[PDB]
Symmetry: D2
Subunit: 332 residues, 4 copies
C-alpha cells in the first residue's frame, strides 16, 4: 500500500520495535518508569528547558498545554486554521473554559504581530482576559521565518503574554533551518513535539516547558486521562526516534520536492511544496474520481478539490514514481 | 450633564415610573407575576413567536439563548465584533462549553454567507459541531439589509442551522426599515429585545422564540441567576416603552445625522453615522485630551482614537449643538 | 390572601415604593448609580467588610460567590441540602467547572467539622483541590450555634480554606442571636444577603467581601448577566429594608412560635419550628387534600407529605388564626 | 523486588510481549488498526454489547463514559468513595459540566437503592437533571452481590436512568462469581474493563456499550486526547490478557486470603480481605517506620495507618511468605 494521506500512518521499524521490547519500565503514575523519565529528561535537555511530560497524543499535549497556561475565563490568540483551535473539537473551550480568539495567518504561516496586537483585550469586564499566544511551527508544512520566531517572543514578553508553539512537526522545521532545536525552542515558553508522525513512533507526544508549569500539566494530564502505567515501552520508541529518525526527515523533504517536480511536469496544478507536503488543485469534478482511481491502485490519498500529499519513512521515491505515473494517467 | 457614551444611560420618565409604581406583581419564579407575563405575551404576539422570557440584561439574554441552542461541544458562527462573542467575556465558551467561530462581518454589518458556509464544520470528530448562526441587527448602528435577513434565514434552513438575532437595538432597525417587527422576525428561530437602551427602560431584555426553546431558556435563566421575584415592576417599564418609545427612535436618528453634519463643519472627521450612532476619527494624540476637554465641560464621551457618539432620549439637539461648539473650539 | 409558601412572596410596602420612585439613579456598568453605590457601601460597613456587590438574585450571588472563590479544578465542601449545592441546578459545577463535595449536616444545621476535615483532599493529582467551605446561616429556618461559627472560622484559618456563608436569611439569624451583624460576619470571608425575602424587596441580593475578591465578582457578575443599568431603583428598596425591616423579623418569629402551638393543640403533628418556619407531617394521604382545602379558602401553601409554612411581613397573626382554624377543621 | 502497592504494577510476560510485537497495526484515528478493532469486537461479544472502544487509561474511560451519558446540566448519582467521583480530580464537573451526586456506599460496596431514590431530582428548574447511576464492581476488592446487580438494573429501568458500571476490576468479580461476564454486564447499559491492573497489560482500558453511545464516545475520546495512532501494539496485550490472564485471577485471591492468615498469626491486625486485597491496621505510629523497614528489604508498600496490600501476577506466595516474615519481625 502507498499511504500519502498523512505522516501519522508511519509504522514502527525493526530497530524501533526491538528497543520497545527491551526497555525497562515501571508505573508512570507512581513515577517509576525509567524509560518514560529518560525520554522526558532527554527532550527537556535537548531544547534547553526544565521539564518534559509524555502524552498519549499531540491533541492532549495541546489540551493540557492550554489548560496549564489559561485559567477559566482567559483567552488564547491562535490561528483560524491552527490545530489546537480547529482540529481539536474546541476542547479548550468545551472542556477548558478558555476563550479562543482566532485570526488568519499570513501566507508564510505566521500570525501577524500587528493583528495579534489588535486582539489583545483591554482590562475591561466586557472582555475575556488575553493570556496566551499559540503558534504552530511547520503550519501545514510551512516553516515560520526563524526571525519571526524571535519577534513573537520579544513581542509577548513586552505584553506579558505566554508564548506556546505547537510543534507537532517542529523537527521538520529544525532540519529545514539546519540549526539546533535549542536555537528556536529558546523563543517560546512551552512547546510540543509529536513522535508518532514523521519521527515514526506508534504513539506519543511531548510537552516541554519550565518545571512549575509542567507540574500543573501533570495534574491536567491526569484529569484528562493521559496518565498511563507501564508507558515506558512506548517512550522507548520515542527516544529511539529522537536519536535516529530526525536527520532523515531531509529525505522526506527531498522526496516531496521531487514529487512536486514530477506532477508539475505532468500537467498537475501544484499550488505549493513545503518540507514534507505538497498541494495540488485537483478540482471538484475529480476530487472523488482521483481518489477512487488511486485507491483502486493501492494508493491512498484524501480526495478533495485541493489534495495534500504527505511524505514520511514509509514511502520511497520508487513508490512516488508510481503515484506520479498513475496521476499522469488519470489526467489523460 | 450631556451623556453620549451610550443609549444605555437613558433614565425612567415620569410616565414610565408611574406605570412602574402602579404595576401588579407576583412571584415570577412561581410564575405569579401578571405584569411580567403580560410583557412576555405582548412581545411574543408582536413578533409572531410562541413565547418570550424576561431577563435582567441583554448579556444574560444572549448567554441564555446560546445555551438553549447549543449543546456542550456544539459551535456557533458569529461576528468577530459581535456583542455575543466579544463583549460578553467569552461566556458562551467559558460558562457554556460552546465553541465560538467568529468571522469578520462585511462593511454593511452582515456576515457573508459564503464565508459562513466555509466555516461550517464537516461531521468529523476533529471538529466542533456547528449548530447556530448568530446575527446582530443594528450592528454598531448599522442596519442590516432586509434582503440579507431573508437569505440568512433561507441559508440556515437549507443547512439545518438555528439562526438567532441579537436585537439589542432591533427597533432602531425596525423604525429604520419602516415595517412591523414581524416582517423581519419571521426570519429567525429566536431573537432578543433590549429595553434598557434606546427604549428608555431602567433594566431588562427579552429573549423570544419557540415554546419548547423558551422552556429550556427558563432552566438556563434560573441557573445563571436571572430568575427574579416581584419583577413585574421592571416589566411594567417594558410595556410602557414598547408602546410609547418606539416611534421617537426616529428623533434619535435625525439628531445623529444632524450632529454628523455639525461635526463636519467644525472640521472634525466623521467616519460614518448609522441610526443613533456616529464615529469620529480623533487620533491617539487627542484621544485622551478630548475626553478630558469634554468632561470638564460636562460632556461625557467614551474617549478613544475613534469616538462613537450615541444619541438617545436624554440628549436633545440643543445639547448636541453645544457639543459641536466645544468640539470646534477643541480643534483650535 | 394568606400566602404561606415562602417569604419570597413578600411585597413592597408603600414607604418602600416611594423611596424607589425617588431614588436617584445612573448606569451601574459605569458605576454611575448613587443608590447602588450607597447600598453596597452601607452593607459593607454594617458587616465590617470592605466591599459589596448588588446582584439580581441570591442564586447569582452564590454562583458569583463560588466562581470568585474557586478556580477551575478547585473544590467546595458543602451541605447535601444546601441551596448552593442542591438548589441552583449545580451551576457551580456546570458553569464554573468547580467540584462540589457535599456531606450531610447535623441536626443543628451545621457541617460537622470532623466530617469536613475528612473531606479535605490531600495534595495528590487524583483529587480535586479543596478550597472553600460553604455554610448556610438559617438553614431551613435553623439558626447555627454561634460558637460553631467561630470554630468553623478558626478551622478554616488553620487548614487554609476560604469560608463563605449563604446568608439569604442571615438577618433572621442575627435577630435570633440578639447581636450585631458584624459579630457573626467577622467569622467568614464572604457572605450573601437576600433582600427579597423576609426583608421584603421586589428584587435583590448582595455578596459582601474583601475589595479584591469583590472585584473578581464584578467580572463574574457581568459574564453571568447581572450587570444592570439603572438598578438604583431596586437598590433603594434595599436601603429602606435594611433601615426599617430588620427589627420586625422578630414578629414573624413570634408568629411562627404561636402558630406551631396552635396546630399542635389542633392535633397537628408539628415536626419542627425554627425562626420564621415550621414543618408539619401531613402524609401522602392528605398532601393533596390539604392543599386544595386551603386553596378554596384563599390560603396558599406548598402541599406535600411534609408541609413547610413560612411567615413574613405579609402574614399577620390574625390570618394565622384563620389558618389554624381551618387546619383543625381539616383534621376533623 | 516485591511490590504490593497495587496491581497496576503488573508488567508484560514474555508471551504478552511477543503478541504485541507480532500484532498487525494501522492508524486508529482512521480506523485502520486491525488489532484495535479485534480487541474491541471481542469485548463487545463477550459481554453482550453492540460496541467497544479502547482508551489509554481507566480514568479517560470513565470521563468519556460520563460525558457520553450526561449532557451539560445533567447528573449522575455515585459513590462518595467511587473512583469516577473521588479519584479522578472531578473531571466530570470540571471538564464535562456534569453535576455529581455522591452518597455513602453500604458496607458490602453497594449504593443502597433506596438511598439513590431520594437523590433523584424532581423535574423542577432549581435542580440538576438526574441521568445516570454509576456503580463500581469490585469496589476496593468488595464483590457486589449479584442480586444487587439485577436489582439496580430493574430499579433504573423503572426510573428510566442509565446504569454504568466502572469495571476496572470486573474480572476479579467474575472469577469470584463463577459466572460468565455476560451474566453480569446484562445488567448495565455500559461498563469499562481495565487491562493494565490484574490482567497484566502495560496500558489500556475499554468502554463498552451501545453503538450510538460508543459513537459519541469516540468524539469525546478525541477531544480528551485518547485518539492514538498505531495502538494495535498496545491492544494486542489486551487480547492476550483476556484470553490468558483471567482464570489465574483466582490464584491472587487465594494468595490474598492466605497472606491475611499469615499476617494474623504474625501478630498483625488484619481488618478485611476481599478478592486480591486485604487491609492492615498498622497505626499512625508505625506507618512510616513500616514503609521504610520493608523498603530496606526490597518490599514496596504504600505506608499509612491502614495499609492496603494488593496481590497480582507479579507476587507469588513464596514472596508473600518472605513479606509476612519481615512483618512478624517488624512487629517484634
Ligand atoms: Na506513526
Ligand atoms: Na436606561
Ligand atoms: Na467550559
Ligand atoms: Na464546567
Ligand atoms: Na419579595
Ligand atoms: Na500493569
Amino acid at each position: 500500500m502507498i499511504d500519502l494521506r498523512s505522516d501519522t500512518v508511519t509504522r514502527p521499524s525493526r530497530a524501533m520495535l526491538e528497543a520497545m521490547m527491551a526497555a525497562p519500565v515501571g508505573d508512570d503514575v507512581y513515577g517509576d518508569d525509567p524509560t518514560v523519565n529518560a525520554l522526558q529528561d532527554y527532550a527537556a535537555e535537548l531544547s534547553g528547558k526544565e521539564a518534559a511530560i509524555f502524552l498519549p497524543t499531540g491533541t492532549q499535549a495541546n489540551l493540557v498545554a492550554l489548560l496549564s497556561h489559561c485559567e477559566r475565563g482567559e483567552e488564547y490568540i491562535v490561528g483560524q486554521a491552527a490545530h489546537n483551535y480547529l482540529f481539536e473539537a474546541g476542547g479548550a473551550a468545551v472542556l477548558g473554559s478558555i476563550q479562543p480568539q482566532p485570526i488568519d495567518a499570513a501566507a508564510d504561516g505566521t500570525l501577524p504581530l500587528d493583528k495579534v496586537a489588535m486582539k489583545i483585550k483591554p482590562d475591561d469586564i466586557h472582555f475575556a482576559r488575553t493570556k496566551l499566544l499559540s503558534l504552530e511551527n511547520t503550519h501545514n508544512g510551512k516553516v515560520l521565518p526563524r526571525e519571526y520566531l524571535k519577534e513573537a517572543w520579544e513581542f509577548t514578553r513586552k505584553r506579558n503574554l505566554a508564548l506556546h508553539v505547537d510543534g507537532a512537526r517542529i523537527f521538520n522545521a529544525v532540519v529545514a533551518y539546519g540549526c539546533e532545536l535549542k536555537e528556536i525552542t529558546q523563543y517560546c515558553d512551552s512547546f510540543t513535539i509529536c513522535l508518532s508522525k514523521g519521527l515514526g513512533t506508534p504513539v506519543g507526544s511531548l510537552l516541554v516547558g519550565n518545571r512549575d508549569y509542567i507540574k500543573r500539566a501533570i495534574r491536567w494530564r491526569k484529569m484528562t486521562g493521559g496518565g498511563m502505567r507501564q508507558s515506558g515501552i512506548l517512550a522507548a520508541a520515542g527516544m529511539y526516534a529522537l536519536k535516529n529518525n530526525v536527520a532523515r526527515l531531509q529525505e522526506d523533504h527531498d522526496n516531496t520536492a521531487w514529487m512536486a517536480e514530477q506532477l508539475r511536469e505532468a500537467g498537475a496544478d501544484v499550488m505549493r511544496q513545503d518540507t514534507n507536503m505538497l498541494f495540488v488543485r485537483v478540482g471538484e469534478e475529480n476530487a472523488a474520481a482521483l481518489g477512487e482511481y488511486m485507491k483502486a491502485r493501492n494508493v491512498l490519498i484524501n480526495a478533495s478539490p485541493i489534495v495534500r500529499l504527505v511524505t514520511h519513512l514509509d514511502v520511497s521515491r520508487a513508490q512516488l514514481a508510481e503515484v506520479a505515473a498513475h496521476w499522469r494517467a488519470f489526467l489523460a
